[PDB]
Design a protein around this ligand. Structure first.
Ligand code: ATP
Ligand code: MG
Ligand code: MG
Length: 1298
RNA sequence: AGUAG
């Protein structure tokens, strides 16, 4: 039952009115938005901005620090060990005591060394012994730390401890710029020195390792990369709750470098810094002699006493993987070079590239990520005909240039951009090479940009910046309401009152006739497609109950209810669903839940979206009623958008590319021709057709919009339904999200209560909140909410411009072909220019102007400009503003094809994943992290990476995971030590090599090595019957015994098929709301009485409350609802793999004891019929986008596997109704049950009639049902076999495999 | 002092 609503009516808008307005418009001097790209122009822009910078800021003479850890390597580095520190540290401390301090930091170094040397033998034994054998002592009160009292420190060190607890350089100057360039070049020269059998293996040991690894395997950047890994592992160890109050001293290399870790604040909070000093022998490497605290003179060498640093947990886990990030970036650069030149980079280029990448990965500053974010938009701006490069250049100077790595990364940027704005071959950025494609040049800067961590900003400044945008745009909206009534901003301005003013065409104001005409223009392609559109709209399930869909019972954020203090409480969607179900006696449809909450005002707050850009973005969290309204609107608009061929975002990811290519091909085929313009009687003029590809981007797409356009937009859209009830419901849904209560988050309010005085900057921001916690926001639709509706509206405006122009100049047969995706868009304006000198064309235009058609004044020279001006104006009539900064005009599609929007099928630079697989891991146990990393590397391979670059990343990630979890030789959890079997023969869940050629991880799945090991052991036992291949079966039986505890298939990650060792890193001791409303016993009897609901969501209020409480009382969702900071998890994992009992065998004992338990059980194992049966059951040039279907499900079924398996467990009326609703095709569930029973008799001797069989295949078929988009070189076919063969053909980088 | 501004 769709509720009645009043709805809108047509206003009789005529196209002729807009055409006449345009005629009057395109008859006068109109200023082009963009500027011409010329070398002199860019050079003058840079020089003038440099001149202004001096006045803008107060100049400084002392470059600030850019190196976090300063090291110095003279000899190859042998990784450190507990047996190495006891010797090194002693030698290094004797050296230090030999020195003579002068500065307070040097004095503190001296005091720490003197204390450490004078520790007693028992103190040292406890100081280096493992935590298991650790014994607390008077001096060494923790394993790897010692206690220094305030009495031993001298006066200088005491003063230094007490001290512990905007200016820019002359970039315009030439002396400063050369000085910085020389310093950074010296550092890069130092990091470039040389310190004194599957087919893929052949192609890797011959091509990649011969030119990349064997080249960097001897440079100072490959050994300092390990020195700064050990130095950061030491800090991570000394950044716990109990350790982080004591002093520590470590030595590395052979005593050359010493790390002095200070009394800090534990990094298990959100605002602590671990502080340290480094004393090293001055030499080649990351040395900045200007920023060293002192250089103490030694007879033969000189020791560089660094200054007391302070590195947070985001800059401490970013140096721990500096080497991996730098090496993966260098591998990507190597791959891109060996596609753009066809030859391997010379030995000299790759070493410099690696040195630059390492120096970038070490310097994790935010003043550099901003520059490398501006550069990505600057490079397309200076390599295109017309662009907004002056604005981007002026943005480049908005920041201080303080350290010597911003005056060098800038100087380089200046040179590169001034050189690119002249050849308009693309000069390289890092090396001295020259490219032959734009893709390589843009990928260089993209990769250099991803080497910076997400969220280096600083918390509260970014939170405030997030709030200010939304507050200021809303205040501007109110100002626009003060001028001209609120009935003009809300309902728009008629055309007749635009021509009288012509200044109403601003953002946040929309015409009425323009919107109606845009809807009518879409109705010319939605009217030949009426039945399909109606069927698509009805296909969306409105009657389907709310809260019975995965999206409404998810774990994403959602605002709660206005509390007593005035702030809007946070929560996740599942608690809100539970609350509504508890307070209501029904589970209502999407429409019937709207009319219940139609009265409630939409409320929203904003949470920082931790990203890697200047001026971080902010995600919007909205209450339940607002979510319901937005769901109604999006469900209506998506069903129509997916039926329009120019609105991308509604495509599957592999059709976005296959459609942009089709559009570009149609444009090119149009260009291959010549048009004839008629003259007085018979003479024709031949005009050459040409294309001008205009990319696009809108400034403040949602933040500066007015969400009342869609009210009149949908009232005219043709959906094909026989009645307007759903249309009117969508109109009302749009009407209720007009006004919102924006709540300032808790952090901003809390700190603003502490400011001594409020500047006018934020006083205008605190006047927007009359209550102090909330404010009214109109028009803005909470960025990220209406994305398909906005894109469809933009497409409508573009087609309106098409029609207006085609009516303006009937004689000229021009060609437009647009493609929109959110705000991003591509316009392919096709124009005509004279073939001869053109005097006849000019005469014809003059004759037309004289005849009476005065709008030809703007169609004589540069026809493509008067098309863009009119298109931009007609878009602005719909409150859409094409950006004057990030838009680009170019005769060639190189600038766009390199980028292709900013969606998800726009690769995602395959580097973004490879560098991502090194961090942000689930932390759910060795297996469940080694699976996630390999899966991310496989995705990177599927996103264009080469097998050799995607199989080096796998090795790097596997080694990092092994170090993190201790599964490394001679470390806490090495399987080979405790278990008799070798490292490669152990199942992955219990600790195994788990490293395979990326072909295995791609073609097959992750964890299939477990199945290989199981098959090997079973075959060996069956045929040879040797004792050797029975220990493995004992290990697998132990795995099943451990796994039997879990039920419901409560798996968050990969499926082992043989069970997993159970870990639990963290527990939110604070029980969640509504997590205890049924007795825990009740939720165990319910889980057995209603078996069906393990698969299909219940669709009844009473039977859904229990299901939601159960999903809330699950020890894998509760973990996922408190893993707010992945950095905290990654840091904790290193200290949890040790004695901490973080894995339960039913008794919460360490993983170290599990190896002994398995060795005991494996030895005392005997083959049994049940074991054999269970084991047998266990073993039952032009880019393009394809679908890699791995296994896929049997066609004869046609019913979702969970639905049918639930049908088998269906005995209650509620369960049967839920099954029938959930099943896509009812009346056929019995067919699939019969098919399953028949099939089980083939590959399995067990019968499904008894339970515990269907639980096995379901994860396998879930993995099979996964279908992923694969980026191929263009010659590949749709089938999986062709994709795999193409991957095979891509093993070599410069040689064919055909 | 450092991170940040
Ligand atoms: N994380 C996101 N999730 C969903 N939609 C998003 C997200 N980020 C941006 N959008 C969509 O893109 C719009 C913003 O576009 P974009 O990020 O290109 O820049 P902008 O805010 O329009 O302005 P400018 O081009 O000046 O940066 C948002 O209003 C929303 O429509
Ligand atoms: Mg944009
Ligand atoms: Mg954009």
């Amino acid at each position: 039952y769709i509720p009645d609503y009043k709805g809108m009516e047509p206003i009789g808008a005529n196209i002729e009115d807009l055409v006449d307005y345009s005629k009057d418009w395109l008859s006068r001097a109109r200023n082009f938005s963009f500027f011409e790209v010329k070398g002199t122009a860019v050079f003058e822009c840079f020089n003038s901005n440099e001149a202004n910078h001096c006045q803008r800021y107060p100049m400084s003479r002392k470059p600030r620090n850019f190196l976090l850890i300063q090291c110095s390597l003279i000899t190859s580095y042998k990784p450190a060990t507990t047996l190495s520190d006891q010797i090194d540290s002693r030698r290094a401390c004797s050296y230090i005591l030999n020195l003579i301090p002068d500065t307070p930091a040097s004095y503190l170094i001296h005091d720490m060394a003197y204390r450490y040397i004078n520790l007693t033998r028992e103190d040292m034994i406890n100081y280096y012994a493992p935590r298991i054998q650790f014994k607390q002592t008077q001096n060494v009160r923790e394993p790897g730390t010692f206690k220094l009292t305030s009495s031993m420190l001298r006066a200088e060190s005491k003063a230094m401890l007490d001290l512990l607890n905007i200016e820019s350089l002359n970039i315009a100057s030439h002396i400063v710029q050369s000085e910085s360039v020389s310093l950074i070049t010296k550092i890069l020269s130092d990091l470039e020195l040389n310190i004194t059998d599957t087919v893929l293996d052949k192609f890797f040991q011959n091509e990649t390792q011969k030119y990349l690894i064997d080249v960097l395997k001897k440079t100072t950047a490959w050994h300092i990369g390990h020195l700064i890994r050990d130095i950061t592992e030491s800090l991570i160890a000394h950044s716990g709750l109990k350790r982080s109050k004591y002093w520590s001293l470590h030595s590395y290399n052979n005593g050359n470098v010493i790390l002095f870790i200070l009394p800090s604040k534990s990094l298990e909070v959100a605002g602590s810094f671990i502080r340290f000093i480094t004393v090293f022998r001055i030499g080649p490497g990351l040395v900045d002699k200007d920023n060293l605290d002192t250089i103490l003179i030694d007879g033969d060498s000189q020791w560089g006493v660094s200054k007391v640093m302070s590195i947070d947990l985001n800059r401490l886990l970013a140096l721990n993987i500096a080497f991996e990030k730098a090496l993966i970036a260098t591998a990507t650069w190597f791959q891109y070079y060996t596609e753009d030149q066809g030859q391997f980079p010379l030995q000299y280029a790759i070493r410099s590239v690696f040195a630059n990448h390492f120096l970038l990965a070490i310097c994790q500053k935010m003043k550099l990520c901003a520059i490398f974010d501006n550069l990505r938009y600057l490079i397309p701006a200076v390599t295109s005909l017309y662009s907004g490069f002056p604005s981007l250049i002026e943005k480049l100077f908005e920041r201080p240039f303080k350290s010597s790595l911003e005056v060098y990364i800038y100087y380089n940027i200046k040179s590169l951009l001034v050189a690119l704005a002249q050849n308009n071959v693309y000069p390289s950025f890092m090396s001295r090479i020259v490219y032959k494609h734009y893709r390589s040049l843009i990928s260089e800067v993209t990769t250099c940009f991803f080497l910076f961590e997400k969220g280096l900003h600083g918390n509260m400044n970014e939170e405030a910046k997030i709030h200010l945008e939304t507050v200021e745009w809303a205040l501007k909206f109110r100002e626009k309401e003060e001028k001209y009534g609120e009935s003009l901003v809300e309902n728009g301005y008629m055309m007749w009152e635009l021509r009288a003013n012509a200044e109403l065409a601003e953002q946040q104001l929309y015409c009425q006739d323009a919107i109606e005409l845009a809807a009518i223009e879409l109705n010319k392609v939605l009217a030949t497609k009426s039945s399909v559109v109606a069927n698509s709209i009805l296909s969306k399930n409105w009657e389907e109950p709310y809260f019975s869909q995965t999206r409404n019972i998810s774990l994403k954020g959602m605002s709660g209810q206005v509390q007593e203090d005035g702030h809007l409480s946070s929560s996740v969607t599942i608690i809100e669903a539970i609350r509504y179900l508890s307070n209501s006696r029904h589970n209502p449809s999407l429409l019937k839940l709207y009319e219940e909450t139609r009265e409630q005002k939409a409320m929203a707050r904003i949470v920082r979206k931790y990203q890697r850009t200047e001026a971080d973005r902010g995600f919007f969290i909205t209450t339940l009623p607002t979510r319901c309204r937005l769901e109604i609107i999006e469900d209506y608009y998506d069903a129509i958008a997916k039926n329009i061929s120019e609105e991308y975002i509604s495509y599957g990811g592999e059709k976005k590319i296959l459609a942009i290519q089709g559009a570009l091909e149609k444009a090119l085929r149009w260009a291959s021709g010549e048009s004839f313009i008629e003259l007085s009687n018979h003479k024709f003029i031949r005009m050459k057709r040409k294309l001008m590809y205009v990319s696009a981007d809108a400034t403040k797409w949602s933040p500066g919009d007015n969400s009342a356009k869609f009210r009149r937009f949908t009232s005219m859209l043709h959906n094909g339904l026989p009645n307007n009830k759903l249309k009117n419901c969508v109109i009302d849904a749009l009407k209720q999200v007009y006004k919102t209560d924006f709540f300032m988050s808790r952090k901003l309010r809390n700190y603003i209560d502490s400011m001594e005085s409020l500047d006018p900057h934020i006083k205008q921001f605190l006047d927007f909140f009359p209550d102090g916690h909330h404010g009214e926001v109109k028009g803005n639709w909470l960025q990220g909410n209406l994305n398909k509706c906005s894109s469809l509206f933009g497409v409508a405006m573009s087609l309106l411009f098409k029609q207006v122009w085609t009516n303006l100049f009937p004689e000229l047969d021009c060609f437009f072909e647009f493609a929109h995706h959110s705000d991003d868009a591509l316009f392919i304006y096709g124009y005509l220019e004279p073939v001869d000198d053109g005097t006849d064309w000019f005469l014809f235009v003059s004759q037309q102007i004289q005849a009476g058609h005065l709008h030809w004044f703007s169609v004589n020279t540069e026809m493509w400009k008067s098309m863009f001006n009119l298109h931009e104006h007609i878009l602005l009539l719909g409150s859409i503003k094409i950006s004057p900064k990030k838009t680009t005009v170019s005769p060639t599609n190189a600038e766009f094809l390199s980028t292709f929007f900013e969606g998800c099928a726009v690769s995602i630079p395959f580097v973004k994943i490879l560098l991502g697989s090194l961090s942000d891991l689930p932390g759910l146990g060795y297996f469940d992290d080694l699976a996630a990393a390999q899966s991310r590397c496989v995705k990177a391979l599927d996103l264009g990476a080469s097998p050799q670059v995607a199989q080096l990343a796998v090795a790097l990630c596997t080694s990092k995971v092994e170090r993190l979890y201790g599964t490394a030789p001679g470390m806490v959890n090495h399987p080979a030590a405790y278990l008799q079997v070798k490292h490669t023969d152990t199942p992955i869940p219990l600790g195994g090599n788990g490293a395979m050629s990326i072909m295995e991880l791609a073609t097959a799945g992750i964890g299939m090595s477990d199945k290989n090991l199981l098959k090997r052991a079973l075959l060996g036992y069956s045929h040879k019957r040797q004792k050797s291949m029975l220990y493995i079966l004992g290990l697998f039986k132990f795995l099943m015994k451990l796994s039997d505890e879990t039920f419901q298939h409560e798996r968050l990650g990969q499926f082992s098929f043989i069970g997993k060792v159970q870990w639990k890193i963290f527990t939110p001791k604070s029980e969640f709301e509504f997590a205890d409303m049924y007795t825990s016993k009740f939720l165990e009897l319910w889980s057995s009485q209603h078996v069906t609901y393990d698969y299909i969501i219940p669709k009844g209020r009473d039977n859904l409350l229990i299901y939601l409480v159960r999903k809330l009382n699950d020890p894998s969702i509760v973990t996922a609802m408190t893993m707010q900071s992945p950095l905290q998890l990654r840091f904790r994992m290193q200290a949890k793999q040790h004695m901490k009992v973080c894995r339960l065998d039913g008794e919460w004992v360490t993983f170290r004891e599990v190896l002994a338990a398995a060795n005991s059980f494996a030895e005392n194992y005997s083959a049994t019929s049940q074991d054999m049966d269970l084991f047998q059951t266990l073993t039952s040039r032009a880019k393009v986008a394809r679908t890699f279907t791995v296994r896929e499900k049997d066609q004869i079924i046609q019913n979702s596997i969970p639905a049918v398996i639930g049908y088998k467990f269906a005995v209650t009326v509620e369960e049967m109704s839920d099954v029938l609703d959930t099943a896509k095709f009812p009346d056929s569930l019995s067919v699939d049950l019969k098919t399953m029973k028949d099939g089980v008799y083939r590959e399995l001797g067990l019968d499904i009639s008894l339970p515990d069989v269907m639980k096995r295949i379901a994860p396998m078929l879930y993995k099979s049902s996964k279908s992923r988009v694969v980026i191929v070189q263009g010659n590949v076919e749709g089938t999986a076999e062709a994709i795999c063969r193409y991957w095979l053909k891509s093993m070599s980088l410069v040689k064919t495999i055909r």
